[PDB]
Design a protein around this ligand. Structure first.
Ligand SMILES: CCCCCCCCCCCCCCCCC[C@@H](O)O[C@H](CO[C@H](O)CCCCCCCCCCCCCCC)COP(=O)(O)OCC[N+](C)(C)C
Ligand SMILES: CCCCCCCC/C=C/CCCCCCCC(=O)OC[C@H](COP(=O)(O)OCCN)OC(=O)CCCCCCC/C=C/CCCCCCCC
Ligand SMILES: CCCCCCCC/C=C\CCCCCCCC(=O)OC[C@H](COP(=O)(O)OCCN)OC(=O)CCCCCCC/C=C\CCCCCCCC
Ligand SMILES: CCCCCCCC/C=C\CCCCCCCC(=O)O[C@H](COC(=O)CCCCCCC/C=C/CCCCCCCC)COP(=O)(O)OCCN
Ligand SMILES: *OP(=O)(O)OCC(C)(C)[C@@H](O)C(=O)NCCC(=O)NCCSC(=O)CCCCCCCCCCC
Lengths: 459, 175, 128, 111, 220, 124, 104, 62, 88, 67, 178
């Protein structure tokens, strides 16, 4: 799989040796080529993984995530190259270096075949993100956002390292294959209870679970647009990947240890979804919607059925694409009016019609309109939950209605009504922004054409 | 046509009555059918025969892959990883084949229900009982394994069911 | 004469039915005068830059910034633990969780007990 | 063979052709409403034939033409039911729609 | 289903007879007809419900088109309190609206007849709720009530619209569309009900005072 | 309905129960009962695919009417005698159902009268 | 915001707000696409009484009609072959209890 | 140009759909399932050639 | 087609027509500069009634704050013309 | 066709709309009368409704209160 | 809408507003013209009866009773003009209203059509630019040091001047912009 890893490490010096006015062109072109190359991982087998070497492997769960990462980097470049125009060439190359390092760490993370290497890269992803947020953010809250993000992650991730070394000493290996084949049941013990908590809590925080989610609004709101895109699209799914990889050793304790988290994920689903109804800031609204969708994914992983796993994979991919698109759409208005308040610039459909239809399509995808992959994932999770308990349908339906309510509320507030009178600096949409929106949204529909590619290994 | 096997996708005789009109009025359906076939089916048949004779000029074959019958999870030592891997792959392939068997029976049942019209409740008894048997056996084999299923968990489920059955049978024999 | 109208929270009292408008004192009249003065000076301040040919962008509204700040970042500095806040937080944060836990635990206990004892209508339950 | 299936699917398919031509150099002219009204009228007159076939011989069909997913034992396919309800309701809806678009060509003339 | 349909049809018919916006009256009539469809579903007559759907489409759509013609002619006015004498000012619109209102009320041998009278007869001849039956009959009466409301307040009397008269319905598009739906609302019930095969057992033996229940309540 | 008025306002035990019926044996008052005759066999109704509720003792006329409808397709008014025959058979079936209801009603009438008379005799 | 004067020349006509005036804490709850507190022709606590009474009366009368059902003076409908035993599901190896209907 | 619309909007789509149904969809089992035609007493089956017997001596009570 | 492009002449003609159909105004005494309070001796209620009459005639409503200070037919025609963007 | 506003006069009509409206109203009424002439039973009923209280105790099969 | 409001409404203003509202709701109740005329003359007489009263306290008390009666007898669904703030066509054409400054963002190929229109637009922009400073100066002269007491604006007092703060009033989009 080094045929994908090495070209990114070559993106590094090509960026650092390109001339001052062609960094963006070269980065975009070669990132798109790398995504085309990584598209070859979708040819997955039906029984086992693709064991490239002793250190790297791929199955049908990590291949869509890798494709999403490689595809997201060019979108991040295109959206970033607007607000960094006045920046010096050295710091622009530094920003591109941060993005490239993030993509490389994610690529190795999604394919590491043993748990300690996966942990090392999963934590290494923190440094470029923190630097991006706290160096290229706009307001003075970026420092606190970075602190919250970093310490929320590490507080949950250090016990995971302790538990991982404990497991390796007790069993002898941490390779995913050996771990799966030699799996043994976990007894109902206090020691096993705390081992379960240590193995689960890092990925709980990374989702984030409701209650441990207070870092996400700060981090996603204070970050630059590329940081927000990478946080919402990919970095939230590391928790889901780790959860669905490490739950193979936590049975049968999960059957009764998932009871609290499930509740926190279900009721929390409602609570965050209600917060979006009263958000005066667009970015915070998008962040809280991300929290609710991730709560649904947590339920899917915790109930641990094949339909739930397929739904979780589909929902992870669909939410990544949708949230990235929503953040980019909000950023266009932000660069227009330099304010994040939703009611400031109103009636934008009159002045930006094509951007208005992008807004409509993004909102329709967000509220899970059939036959999008968003709906496929949500519906599979809902059916799995109904099999788990028939009373869950009440909470799921409440969440569906509130999701539609706040999605269309945001669309109506920003796009419809009458324009604000004094705002006269709304220029026509650039080709770059429309191309960015189209490149976000076309893969979503092309994927609902062939959904088995994002349904995971349980398919 | 012969593109599939009639024994696995069995169909009825398809007896159709003969047209016996009681009235001398022209039948619009027959005239519309004649116009349709002349204007549509003839060009479609011509194009298909042209494409078929093009395909006949370059004919190649593809084959169905054959798999051996390696030892199963019951013939593997506790920590032998090669035998475990072989048995696990074989079990997963068998699981896929069983899924397709259930799919075939479900297709049979759906086709029977659509074909039989208003008599489906009585005329689709054999298909319903076939589906009941097949689904019962599939549920006995693979249900409740969850995600992270394997040959070992299936074997443990089978062993537990067999232990319960043996205990019940010996209790009954104790009467 | 006629049955009265009883106002409430979601159906307020009309102005023409409000006795506060039919008993006017000079203090209220000068209060209305200064209210109109404040409104008029704000309107002038807005209109002076609204009609400026050389202005390009967004006219900053301090009221909007004050509102968003008060609704977002000014809440915690002004929060104080009190019996009201403590009880409300405990209730609205823990009660729903325990209620849903009890409901789901009871439902799943019933389902599992029925499954072990041997009747749940599990026929055709292949997909789970 | 059996024009029932072909005609029933064609009635549904031809309605999408104006949506395909929503980007051509007809959506920007004033001939587009007449184009859509004509398409709906043609769809109605085409759907009148399967209705005749049902009224004659009571013909009913199901057409599973495209297979989408197979999860484990649940196969999801693009399947159309062409029983009495569908073949009777489709022409009525097409007729009502034809009349309403003809009316809208006058009601919304200034839009 | 039966109770839901009965309460819906009666409630919406009750709300309709005091409305002054013409579109609102037609909308509440639509809701009442949908309630009647749920009632006939609740008595195990799905095919009658589908038949009623197919017939109701015709005259309800053309009634809305007539309302739109009136609204466009009277300078975008929808309140019936400002629609005066249009019986002579709009002859085609008034004849189409009268025919639609008669088909809606179940006047014999019209499209509404072959569905609504059969639905009422089946409801009268079933082991059903007593309250649902009574609500259905009262809704059948209120249908004629609000049809009378529309016709009386929009077409009879003296003008109540602004003096600048723009009344002009001489456009082939409007005339042809309404004419097609009018031919439908006259002949479609007879054509359709005589061609579909019998999918249910009829009610061939019922008391004379009960065979006329729909007509009687409509007249009252 | 008047029967509803009598049942829900008068002596309900003196009126038949529509759900629980018949209460008396079919030969309680009939010296000789003749079994009802079915004209169409099971296979014919199955092949005609009539319906699960149209397969009553009048299904032969329905089969004839369906055949006449299918055979004379373009002229949809050419089946009036068959339609009338099916309606008349259904009407006769409804008359028999009404006769059964009335017979059960007056059998309960006689049973109540006989019980009260026997109780009166027991009073002496 | 619906209670605001619709004829005053607001700086934001749809929102009905002027530049610089204090904004209500719950403005986004009163944006007039949402919760409306305008006075009503009928007093609150009178509309509630009427609506609750209507709904409760309908529920009670529906239950009453349920336990006093309407029907016709007819006997149960009869079906020829043991009430269509073979066609209503089947089980053709049982020979169930005969269901015979006699002439009347 | 007199009747181009019918050729381009009806004939071509029906050709494509008829091809796709006759040679691709119907190539697989059970993709197209029709309701069994009704059989009445007195008809003759086209293939078998048998004749269904008449329906048992109507009492003819008119 | 919708209503024709109403002009200044039509507005003035129709306002004067409506005012001439008023039984409290002498038709030959009424001109287009004629003040309602002075040149015709009407009171506030009459002016309110005239305003409602013009509202009913022209199909739109003049708010009370604006209507109370229209005391000449020329003022009314100017207000109506300004509302409908009549420039000819 | 061009029709002008009239300002408090009855609107100018056309012979076409008048004859069309009259033709369709006449068509409706003719259809109603013709159908009632041919298919009156669909409104008035066809088969007689029997009276149960007239039936004799013998055809209902009940003994005269003997046993 | 076009008139600067005052700090309060006088008793005569309130009486006239109640009179207009009562007449409108009465017309809503009496749909026919002759019946409305009869009851409107009765209402006019009822208003005329107390117009001569000199005691202001009992006058405002009678106004209060009048207000209470109106609320009780008001129409639940009064007639609203289509373009009125409650009508069925209130804000129907706001989606077609485009501000004029949008024309500054047009492509040169777009401005190639309508050359005369953009020449006139350049004239208007130049006029606004030359008049702005005089408008600001005039507005600065006429207001008290404590700020304006009302939102009424003054006119131009010189031959070459323009009424201050005129651009957005004059360049309204239209009532039917499309
Ligand atoms: C903001 C949100 C963050 C995430 C929150 C995560 C929640 C984590 C909680 C995990 C739930 C399970 C933990 C304990 C397992 C059993 C539950 C408890 O009731 O134990 C009972 C025992 O009774 C008592 O409860 C024992 C525990 C008493 C002390 C625990 C109370 C702690 C208070 C909660 C603190 C809030 C969590 C956050 C801390 C910062 C069960 O009785 P028994 O069947 O015999 O024991 C089964 C376990 N055995 C077999 C291993 C022995
Ligand atoms: C089935 C599970 C859920 C059941 C329903 C429970 C209620 C759910 C809570 C509703 C959440 C609403 C908050 C967010 C909505 C946004 C605010 C909003 O939309 O504004 C209100 C807006 C404005 O009102 P207008 O009359 O149009 O005024 C226009 C002129 N001024 O109107 C609305 O949208 C109000 C809709 C609220 C619906 C709540 C009532 C629903 C109750 C249903 C009970 C009946 C169940 C049916 C049983 C059927 C039998 C099987
Ligand atoms: C138009 C221009 C081209 C016209 C010439 C083409 C004429 C017909 C020749 C086509 C070639 C034959 C062909 O179509 O091959 C079949 C081929 C695949 O065969 P399957 O085996 O059923 O699917 C793969 C899984 N086994 O089918 C196709 O891909 C084309 C036909 C697809 C149906 C039309 C598309 C409708 C679906 C759109 C997406 C809808 C979203 C999902 C729907 C959810 C429904 C549950
Ligand atoms: C954003 C904030 C997130 C906070 C997450 C941090 C808490 C995560 C849960 C606790 C993790 C600690 C687990 C320790 C490592 C696990 C290794 C293990 O399980 O081995 C056990 C050892 O188990 C332990 O010793 C666990 C001791 C725990 C001490 C640390 C206390 C930390 C706080 C405890 C309460 C809070 C936990 C949940 C909080 C959730 C966050 C709100 C067996 O060892 P033996 O001694 O050999 O026993 C078998 C032979 N007799
Ligand atoms: O400036 P002018 O035009 O001359 O105004 C004259 C004015 C009346 C202002 C003047 O004479 C004056 O100041 N009068 C003082 C007393 C006064 O007018 N008090 C108010 C009388 S209230 C009244 O009685 C009205 C009765 C009707 C109330 C409505 C009830 C019906 C509503 C139901 C609608 C269906």
């Amino acid at each position: 799989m080094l045929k994908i890893i090495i070209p990114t490490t070559m993106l590094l010096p090509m960026t650092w040796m390109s001339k001052h006015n062609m960094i963006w062109i070269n980065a975009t072109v070669h990132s798109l080529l790398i995504s085309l190359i990584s598209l070859s991982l979708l040819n997955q087998l039906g029984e086992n993984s693709l064991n490239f070497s002793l250190t790297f492997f791929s199955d049908s769960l990590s291949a869509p995530l890798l494709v999403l990462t490689t595809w997201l980097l060019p979108l991040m470049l295109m959206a970033s190259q607007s607000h960094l125009s006045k920046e010096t060439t050295t710091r622009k190359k530094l920003y591109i270096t941060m993005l490239i390092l993030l993509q490389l760490f994610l690529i190795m993370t999604f394919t590491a075949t043993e748990l300690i290497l996966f942990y090392i890269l999963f934590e290494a992803t923190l440094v470029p993100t923190l630097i991006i947020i706290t160096r290229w953010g706009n307001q003075t809250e970026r420092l606190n956002a970075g602190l919250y993000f970093l310490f929320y992650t590490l507080a949950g991730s250090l016990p995971l390292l302790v538990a991982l070394v404990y497991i390796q000493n007790t069993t002898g290996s941490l390779n995913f294959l050996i771990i799966h084949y030699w799996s043994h049941p976990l007894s109902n013990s206090w020691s096993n209870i705390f081992m379960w908590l240590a193995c689960i809590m890092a990925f709980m925080v990374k989702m984030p679970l409701y209650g441990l989610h207070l870092w996400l609004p700060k981090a996603h709101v204070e970050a630059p647009i590329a940081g927000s895109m990478v946080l919402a699209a990919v970095l939230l799914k590391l928790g889901g990947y780790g959860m669905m990889r490490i739950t193979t050793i936590l049975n049968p304790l999960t059957n009764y240890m998932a009871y609290p988290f499930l509740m926190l994920s279900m009721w929390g689903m409602i609570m965050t979804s209600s917060i979006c109804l009263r958000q005066t800031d667009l970015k915070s609204l998008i962040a809280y919607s991300s929290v609710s969708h991730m709560a649904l994914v947590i339920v899917a992983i915790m109930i641990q059925t094949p339909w739930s796993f397929m739904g979780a994979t589909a929902l992870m991919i669909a939410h990544g694409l949708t949230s990235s698109m929503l953040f980019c759409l909000a950023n266009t208005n932000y660069e227009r009016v330099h304010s994040r308040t939703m009611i400031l610039a109103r009636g934008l459909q009159t002045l930006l019609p094509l951007m208005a239809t992008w807004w409509l399509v993004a909102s329709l995808t967000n509220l899970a309109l059939p036959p999008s992959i968003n709906l496929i994932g949500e519906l599979f999770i809902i059916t799995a939950s109904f099999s788990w308990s028939n009373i869950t349908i009440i909470l799921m339906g409440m969440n569906m209605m509130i999701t539609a309510l706040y999605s269309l509320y945001m669309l109506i507030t920003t796009q419809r009504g009458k324009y604000t009178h004094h705002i006269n600096n709304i220029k026509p949409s650039f080709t770059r922004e429309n191309a960015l929106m189209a490149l976000h949204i076309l893969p979503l529909l092309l994927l609902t054409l062939n959904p088995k590619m994002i349904l995971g290994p349980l398919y | 046509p012969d593109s599939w096997d009639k024994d696995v996708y069995p169909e009825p005789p398809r007896r159709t009555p003969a047209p016996a009109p009681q009235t001398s009025l022209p039948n619009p359906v027959t005239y519309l059918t004649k116009i349709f076939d002349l204007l549509v089916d003839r060009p479609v048949t011509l194009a298909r025969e042209f494409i078929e004779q093009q395909h006949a000029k370059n004919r190649y074959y593809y084959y169905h892959r054959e798999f051996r019958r390696v030892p199963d999870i019951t013939e593997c030592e506790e920590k032998d990883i090669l035998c475990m891997f072989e048995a696990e792959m074989q079990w997963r392939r068998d699981y896929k084949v069983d899924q397709e068997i259930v799919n075939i029976i479900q297709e049979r049942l759906k086709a029977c229900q659509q074909r039989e019209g208003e008599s489906y409740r009585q005329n689709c008894a054999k298909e319903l009982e076939q589906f009941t048997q097949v689904s019962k056996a599939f549920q006995d084999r693979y249900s409740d394994l969850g995600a992270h299923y394997s040959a070992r968990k299936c074997l443990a489920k089978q062993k537990q069911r067999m232990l319960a059955e043996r205990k019940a049978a010996k209790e009954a024999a104790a009467a | 004469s006629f049955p009265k109208y009883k106002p409430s929270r979601l159906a307020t009292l009309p102005a023409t039915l409000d006795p506060a408008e039919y008993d006017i004192s000079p203090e209220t009249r000068k209060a209305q005068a200064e209210r109109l003065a404040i409104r008029s000076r704000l309107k002038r301040e807005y209109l002076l830059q609204y009609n400026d040919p050389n202005r390009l962008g967004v006219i900053e509204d301090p009221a909007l910034i004050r509102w968003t700040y008060a609704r977002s970042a000014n809440i915690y500095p002004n929060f104080r633990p009190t019996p009201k806040t403590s009880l409300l937080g405990a209730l609205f944060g823990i009660g729903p969780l325990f209620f849903w836990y009890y409901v789901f635990k009871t439902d799943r206990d019933k389902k599992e007990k029925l499954i072990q004892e041997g009747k749940l209508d599990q026929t055709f339950n292949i997909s789970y | 063979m059996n024009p029932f299936a072909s005609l029933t699917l064609t009635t549904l398919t031809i309605l999408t052709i104006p949506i395909m031509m929503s980007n051509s150099n007809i959506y920007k002219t004033n001939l587009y409403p007449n184009y859509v009204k004509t398409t709906v009228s043609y769809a109605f007159t085409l759907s009148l034939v399967p209705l005749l076939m049902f009224m004659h011989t009571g013909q009913e069909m199901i057409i599973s033409n495209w297979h989408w997913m197979t999860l484990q034992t649940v196969e999801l396919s693009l399947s159309f039911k062409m029983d009495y309800f569908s073949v009777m309701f489709i022409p009525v809806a097409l007729f009502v729609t034809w009349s309403i678009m003809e009316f809208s060509m006058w009601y919304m003339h200034s839009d | 289903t039966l109770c839901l349909g009965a309460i819906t049809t009666l409630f919406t018919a009750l709300c309709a007879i005091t409305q002054n916006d013409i579109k609102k009256i037609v909308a509440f009539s639509t809701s009442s007809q949908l309630g009647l469809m749920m009632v006939t579903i609740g008595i195990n007559q799905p095919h009658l419900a589908f038949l009623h759907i197919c017939m109701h489409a015709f005259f309800k759509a053309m009634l809305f088109m007539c309302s739109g013609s009136i609204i466009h002619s009277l300078n975008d006015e929808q309140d019936i309190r400002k629609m005066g004498g249009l019986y002579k000012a709009m002859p085609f619109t008034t004849t189409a609206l009268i025919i639609g209102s008669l088909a809606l009320t179940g006047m014999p041998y019209l499209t509404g007849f072959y569905s609504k009278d059969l639905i009422i007869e089946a409801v009268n001849m079933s082991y059903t709720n007593a309250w649902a039956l009574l609500m259905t009959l009262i809704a059948t009466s209120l249908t004629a009530a609000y049809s009378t409301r529309i016709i009386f307040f929009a077409f009879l009397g003296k003008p109540r619209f602004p003096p600048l008269v723009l009344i002009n319905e001489n456009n082939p598009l409007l005339i042809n569309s309404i004419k097609r739906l009018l031919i439908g609302s006259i002949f479609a019930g007879f054509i359709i009900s005589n061609n579909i095969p019998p999918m249910t057992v009829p009610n061939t033996t019922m008391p004379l005072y009960m065979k006329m229940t729909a007509l009687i309540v409509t007249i009252m | 309905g008047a029967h509803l008025a009598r049942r829900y306002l008068g002596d309900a035990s003196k009126e038949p129960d529509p759900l629980r019926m018949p209460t008396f044996p079919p030969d309680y008052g009939f010296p000789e009962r003749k079994e009802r005759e079915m004209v169409a066999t099971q296979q014919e109704m199955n092949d005609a695919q009539l319906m699960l509720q149209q397969r009553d003792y009048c299904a032969h006329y329905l089969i004839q009417l369906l055949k006449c409808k299918r055979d004379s397709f373009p002229n949809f008014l050419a089946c009036k005698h068959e339609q009338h025959d099916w309606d008349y058979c259904e009407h006769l079936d409804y008359v028999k159902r009404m006769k059964e209801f009335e017979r059960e009603r007056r059998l309960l009438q006689r049973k109540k009268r006989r019980e009260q008379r026997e109780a009166e005799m027991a009073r002496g | 915001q619906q209670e605001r004067d619709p004829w005053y020349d607001w700086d934001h006509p749809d929102l009905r707000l002027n530049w610089g005036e204090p904004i209500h804490w719950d403005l986004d709850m009163y944006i007039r696409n949402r919760v409306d507190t305008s006075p009503t022709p009928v007093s609150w606590n009178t509309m509630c009484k009427h609506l609750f009474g209507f709904v409760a009366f309908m529920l009670f009368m529906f239950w009453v009609g349920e336990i006093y059902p309407s029907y016709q003076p007819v006997g149960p409908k009869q079906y020829p072959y043991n009430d269509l035993y073979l066609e209503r599901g089947g089980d053709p190896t049982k020979e169930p209890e005969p269901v015979v209907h006699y002439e009347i | 140009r007199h009747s181009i619309f019918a050729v381009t909007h009806v004939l071509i789509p029906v050709w494509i759909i008829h091809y796709y149904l006759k040679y691709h969809v119907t190539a697989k089992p059970y993709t197209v399932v029709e309701r069994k035609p009704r059989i009445f007493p007195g008809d003759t089956i086209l293939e078998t050639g048998e004749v269904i017997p008449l329906m048992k001596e109507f009492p003819d009570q008119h | 087609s919708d209503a024709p492009p109403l002009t200044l002449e039509a507005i003035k003609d129709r306002v004067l027509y409506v005012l001439k159909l008023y039984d409290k105004i002498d038709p030959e005494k009424l001109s287009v500069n004629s003040h309602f309070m002075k040149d015709l001796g009407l009171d506030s209620l009459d002016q309110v009634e005239i305003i409602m009459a013009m509202e009913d005639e022209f199909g739109f409503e003049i708010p009370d704050i604006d209507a109370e200070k229209l005391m000449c037919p020329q003022e009314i025609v100017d207000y109506i013309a300004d509302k409908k963007d009549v420039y000819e | 066709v061009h029709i002008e506003p009239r300002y408090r006069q009855f609107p100018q009509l056309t012979r076409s709309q008048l004859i069309q409206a009259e033709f369709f109203s006449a068509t409706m009424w003719f259809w109603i009368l013709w159908r009632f002439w041919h298919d009156s039973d669909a409104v008035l009923g066809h088969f007689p409704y029997p009276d149960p209280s007239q039936w004799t105790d013998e055809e209902l099969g009940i003994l005269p209160d003997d046993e | 809408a076009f008139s600067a409001p005052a700090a309060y409404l006088t008793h005569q203003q309130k009486v006239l507003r109640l009179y207009k509202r009562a007449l409108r709701h009465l017309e809503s109740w009496c749909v026919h013209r002759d019946k409305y005329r009869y009851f409107a003359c009765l209402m006019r007489a009822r208003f005329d009866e107390h117009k001569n009263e000199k005691d202001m306290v009992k006058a405002t008390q009678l106004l209060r009773q009048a207000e209470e009666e109106f609320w009780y007898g008001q129409h639940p669904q009064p007639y609203i003009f289509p373009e009125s703030p409650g009508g069925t066509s209130y804000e129907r054409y706001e989606c077609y209203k485009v501000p004029e400054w949008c024309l500054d963002d047009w492509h040169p190929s777009e401005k190639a059509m309508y050359p005369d229109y953009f020449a006139k637009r350049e004239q208007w922009k130049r006029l606004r630019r030359e008049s702005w400073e005089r408008e600001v100066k005039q507005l600065q002269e006429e207001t008290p040091p404590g700020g304006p007491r009302t939102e009424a604006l003054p006119p131009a007092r010189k031959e070459g001047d323009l009424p201050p703060l005129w651009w957005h009033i004059v360049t309204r989009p239209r009532e039917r912009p499309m």
